[PDB]
């Protein structure tokens, strides 16, 4: 807006949101071309820093070494703009009868060292209390790779900074994880709630009450006391608007609290 090139690099969790936002953006600003790259959040900071991206969608905040990289070039920190909320989900096969899980258990299932406290080395669904034909069917793990922000977020929050079991079947994206789980009766995976389909179900979690809720961000380069380039500016105005936030709902995520969207618009001078 009004003309130019918009380049997005980062999160797969936010892949379809950026795409739907971009389509509605191109409809309203037809001389703008938008490129969208969605291999995982960790690709956002170096692309932002080097300059090949104007927008860096991330499903976790930047780590310190990512922040200082941006800072050493620009002289200030990049700006995390909240654009949605994710209830990061545990997915199982639709026929899996599991009732729910505790954080303790989730940790026991995916992690090497269960830093959340459990003394369970979970390997079978019986270790989770399922009976009959389920009792020593193996727990097959599906997850994201290390470029995923969800990967890191999960490692930080669900594993208490622990490490994943060695045997996790890492998928290239969130849809792959859901598809993998949907075709594996004894499968379990994690990914954004928006990636839910009929072929899988989400397991209830126990510890505002959802224990793995997180903000989803789009990082931008906003210099202190300087306005955003009209191209980014108009994009984020679209994203944080009523229209942009209904896109969030339609894709299956959770819209920002109204105040949070307003503050974001304010703070960016939008």
From Swiss-Prot:
Induction: By phosphate starvation (at protein level), shown for protein in MDR25 and for RNA in MDR1. Different strains have widely differing amounts of protein that can be sheared from the cell surface, in order of decreasing quantities MDR25 >> MDR1 > PAO1 > MDR13. One of its GO terms (biological process) is cell adhesion. It is found in: Periplasm; Secreted. Belongs to the PstS family. Keywords: Cell adhesion, Periplasm, Phosphate transport, Secreted, Signal, Transport, Virulence. Protein sequence obtained for strain MDR1, using protein removed from the cell surface by vigorous vortexing (2 minutes) on cells grown in about 300 uM phosphate. Coiled coil: none annotated. Its main location: periplasm. It comes from the Bacteria. GO terms for molecular function: phosphate ion binding. GO terms for cellular component: extracellular region; periplasmic space. Binds 1 inorganic phosphate per subunit, required for phosphate transport. In virulent strain MDR25, which expresses very high levels of this protein, implicated in host cell adhesion; antibody fragments against this protein decrease adhesion to host cells and increase transepithelial resistance of human epithelial cell monolayers. It comes from Pseudomonas aeruginosa. This is Phosphate-binding protein PstS. It holds the Pfam family PBP_like_2. The lineage of its organism: Bacteria, Pseudomonadati, Pseudomonadota, Gammaproteobacteria, Pseudomonadales.
């Amino acid at each position: 807006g009004v003309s130019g090139n918009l380049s997005s690099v980062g999160s797969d969790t936010l892949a379809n949101l950026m795409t739907m936002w971009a389509e509605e953006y191109k409809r309203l600003y037809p001389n703008v071309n938008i490129q969208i790259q969605a291999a995982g959040s960790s690709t956002a900071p170096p692309a932002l820093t080097e300059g090949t991206a104007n927008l860096g969608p991330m499903s976790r905040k930047m780590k310190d070494v990512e922040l200082q990289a941006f800072e050493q070039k620009y002289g200030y920190k990049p700006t995390a703009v909240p654009v949605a909320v994710d209830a990061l989900a545990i997915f199982v096969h639709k026929d899996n009868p599991i009732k729910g899980l505790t954080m303790q258990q989730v940790d026991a299932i995916f992690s090497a060292t269960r830093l959340c406290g459990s003394k369970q080395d979970v390997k079978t669904w019986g270790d989770l209390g399922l009976t009959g034909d389920w009792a020593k069917k193996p727990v097959q793990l599906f997850g994201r790779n290390s470029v995923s922000g969800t990967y890191g977020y999960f490692k930080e929050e669900a594993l208490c900074k622990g490490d994943f079991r060695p045997n996790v079947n890492e998928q290239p994206g969130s849809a792959s994880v859901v598809q993998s789980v949907s075709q594996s009766l004894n499968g379990i995976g994690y990914s954004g709630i928006g990636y839910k389909t009929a072929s899988v179900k989400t397991v209830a979690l126990a510890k505002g009450t959802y224990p793995l809720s997180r903000f989803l961000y789009v990082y931008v380069n906003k210099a202190p006391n300087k306005p955003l380039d009209p191209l980014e500016a108009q994009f984020l105005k679209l994203v944080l608007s009523k229209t942009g936030q209904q896109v969030v709902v339609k894709d299956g995520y959770i819209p920002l609290p109204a105040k949070v969207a307003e503050k974001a618009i304010k703070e960016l001078g939008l």
